[PDB]
Design a protein around this ligand. Structure first.
Ligand SMILES: Nc1ncnc2c1ncn2[C@@H]1O[C@H](COP(=O)(O)OP(=O)(O)OP(=O)(O)O)[C@@H](O)[C@H]1O
Ligand SMILES: Nc1ncnc2c1ncn2[C@@H]1O[C@H](COP(=O)(O)OP(=O)(O)OP(=O)(O)O)[C@@H](O)[C@H]1O
Ligand SMILES: [Mg+2]
Ligand SMILES: [Mg+2]
Ligand SMILES: [Mg+2]
Ligand SMILES: [Mg+2]
Ligand SMILES: [Mg+2]
Ligand SMILES: [Mg+2]
Lengths: 433, 433
């Protein structure tokens, strides 16, 4: 029967067919050591002279990289093979040979070259591991919220009015690409108690930093009656579950990426530290004095990326920063009962310098307060009228957050740039392939 | 403990708290019959005079629609209540009262009014059922492909070049909203054997028909080494599994929509009929003679919606139509070995007049043939060069399809328009809220 390398350990000492591509070849006299990939993994396949037909052994002697082929053989249990298993080849059929030199040969390639050839580079071991860890998280997120009784609520991408990317529609009229679905999620929250969006979002960010895409995916849970304290608990619950799931089921992928499991274990176990904005600023300024490279943060200013980086390295797991000043936050955020100047909001910083992976807050449930803050921020009340209906009719305290998938993937996989954490990234100077 | 109506049957004869909104009130002398919604369902809650405080019984006597409230009480097991359970109220706390008349009152509303107030209308029973059946399918799709060992492969939305919606990027440069991710999925297929995208797609369709959105979601599986015959089998496997899952777990939702389960049962059981384009055209022309309202289809012309509608009503479950003429299909489709004029492609038509829910084909794996067809269709070879790399390096026969989520939801829920099958639809004359 045809099998995948994924489940090769099941079919020990058994006749199997593999369908895939030649990744690596090493012909030593009267034996070929192939490395096959079938899209589910990488496996050693030996073609010994005598055990195969001579016509087979000739093709295998001059068989280039990314040769599509079908392979028949018995699965041995070799201790000194990758993964602890190999295939003893009995017959081989070539399906396709490369037209030209395969661009991603056995050389050091620059990131630009690799990203230009991303459609091929995805076939290789490191991207392979990343996209599998990405898949694991996408499934895990669904299971997580599914069992909690949350309802997936796809927010719209095309948004009527309002930097943002604008879309030319019909007869001159224009729409904009969603930067966040939270406003719609709030409608869904009052409709279905506990919801979450899970679609793409688009920010026209001129940055070319290691944590910004023009196009990325954001999981945005929103729950009715849920408070700021509960918001952070749910955030902790999600991120710790996700990291645990990767450690449990994608340890082989982590190893391929050279990622130390012990870096992630604490994140999986929860008990995330909690700072206030005030305490966090103090700690940053304390670090800033110790290390001149870490810049200081004047109280009232927002956290730049180097502030978050330095702050996150002081802990072994994600850290919450809560209760920022109202003046540097969004209009919809509920103010702190004790301190009018603060808002009940939180960011979760991943460790090892990765910084913000989640951003959330409690939302205003009072009609006149929200109405008052709309004008204070100098926003047109017309465009947020449907948003105000959520305060006019059946208003309740509610909270939510947005989890960046690419950020979380980058952190968990230990990547240098978020672009590597999505099949085909879209940045300022990168729109291809 | 606080509970949801979702799981009310678990907490029989037990003290529970509910948090939600008042949907319906009926005050008959010395007893109030409330219908509560908490976002997970609808439950009867009785407020009898004597069993509650007098101050409570006063508020309940004049308590409008969409009053946010908290309710304490014991869950009785009343045979003559909705769902077979109710709540005997012991205490009640008002959280919020509507500012103004609730727009969606107990009147017949036009679809335009309802869609204008979609952010509120989602709270109501019929949309509630639709979005839950939508959620079920989104989870089910993930489970389906997850257990088959497929890898979710998010294709890009922003696409570099070439009716599409164009996006203004930076400094004059422009991109386009993806109409399909299949080209990228094919890259993922050769990278990961078996993949599927599950993101939004955008078509600038000037139609205002019951089955067209400007923005909708498409599940696009793609598998390496998979043939046209296997493609249809997988399509059958998916759609029959999804319909079965809805019958199994969302029968209560179907009942709320007034959807006859017996309409769907055959679709869940598989054994889908398979017509050729030729046979399908014959059958349409046979119907066309019988019924003057059904238009005829000259061989060679593409299927219009009324053709598909009439064809689909002649079967009790989805029907495959395969092997259309090459001249009216896309360049990437693999030609039929037997008949050069035909291509190995298929559409799956849902019954009851719903028509196409899936569209797929086998793909060309020969470099020169694909190169030849690119120029025949008059397409720039420059922009499809990365696509051609998939034929240059490690080419294999491969197939895939695209399943429209909103179409499938509309069919299963028995809706008159696809706009009702997505939280916030986007059509020609509909971009709000
Ligand atoms: N351009 C982007 N690329 C990738 N992920 C992003 C991007 N912008 C935001 N995110 C992710 O989405 C989450 C929620 O978005 P939010 O609006 O809170 O971010 P933000 O504060 O604007 O992020 P930053 O300040 O880092 O740009 C963030 O915590 C982050 O993980
Ligand atoms: N505008 C749309 N809104 C919602 N679903 C759509 C839309 N266009 C296509 N789909 C869905 O996506 C699937 C794959 O798209 P495909 O390009 O094959 O369809 P199509 O030929 O454009 O269909 P039609 O002729 O009905 O518009 C279809 O089978 C359908 O279920
Ligand atoms: Mg930002
Ligand atoms: Mg920030
Ligand atoms: Mg933030
Ligand atoms: Mg179309
Ligand atoms: Mg069609
Ligand atoms: Mg089609």
């Amino acid at each position: 029967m045809r099998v995948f390398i994924d489940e090769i350990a099941r079919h020990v000492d058994q006749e199997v067919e593999l369908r895939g591509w030649l990744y690596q070849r090493r012909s030593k006299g009267k034996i070929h050591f192939l490395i096959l990939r079938d899209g589910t993994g990488f496996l050693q396949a030996t073609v010994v002279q005598g055990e195969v037909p001579e016509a087979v052994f000739r093709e295998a002697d001059h068989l280039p990289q990314e040769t599509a082929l079908r392979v028949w053989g018995r699965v041995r249990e070799d201790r000194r093979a990758p993964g602890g298993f190999e295939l003893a080849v009995r017959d081989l059929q070539v399906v396709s040979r490369p037209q030209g030199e395969y661009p991603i040969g056995p050389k050091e390639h620059g990131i630009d070259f690799l990203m230009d050839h991303r459609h091929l580079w995805l076939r290789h071991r490191r991207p392979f591991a990343v996209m599998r860890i990405r898949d694991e998280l996408e499934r895990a997120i669904h299971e997580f919220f599914g069992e909690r009784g949350f309802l997936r609520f796809d927010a719209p991408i095309l948004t009527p009015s309002a930097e943002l990317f604008e879309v030319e529609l019909f007869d001159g009229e224009k729409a904009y690409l969603s930067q966040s679905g939270q406003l719609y999620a709030e409608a869904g929250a009052l409709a279905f108690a506990k919801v979450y969006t899970f679609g793409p979002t688009f920010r026209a960010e001129r940055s070319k930093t290691r944590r910004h895409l023009l196009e990325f995916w954001m999981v945005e849970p929103e729950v009715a009656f849920m408070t700021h304290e509960e918001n952070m608990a749910l955030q902790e619950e999600l991120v710790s579950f996700l990291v645990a799931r990767v450690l449990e089921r994608r340890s082989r992928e982590l190893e391929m990426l050279g990622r130390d499991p012990k870096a992630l274990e604490p994140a999986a176990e929860g008990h995330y530290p909690r700072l206030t904005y005030k305490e966090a600023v103090a700690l940053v300024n304390r670090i800033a004095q110790e290390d001149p490279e870490v810049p200081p943060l004047p109280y009232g200013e927002d956290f730049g990326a180097p502030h978050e980086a330095a702050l996150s390295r002081r802990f072994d797991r994600p850290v919450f920063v809560e209760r920022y000043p109202a003046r540097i936050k969004a209009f919809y955020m509920e103010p702190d009962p004790e301190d009018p100047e603060l808002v009940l909001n939180d960011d979760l910083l991943a460790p090892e310098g990765y910084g913000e992976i989640i951003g959330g807050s409690q939302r205003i449930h009072d009609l006149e307060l929200l109405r008052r803050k709309i004008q204070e921020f100098g926003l047109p009340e017309e465009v947020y009228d449907w948003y105000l209906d959520l305060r006019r009719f059946g208003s309740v305290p509610h909270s939510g957050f947005g989890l960046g998938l690419e950020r979380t993937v980058a952190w968990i996989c230990g990547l240098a740039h978020v672009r590597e954490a999505i099949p085909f990234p879209r940045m300022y100077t990168r729109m291809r392939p």
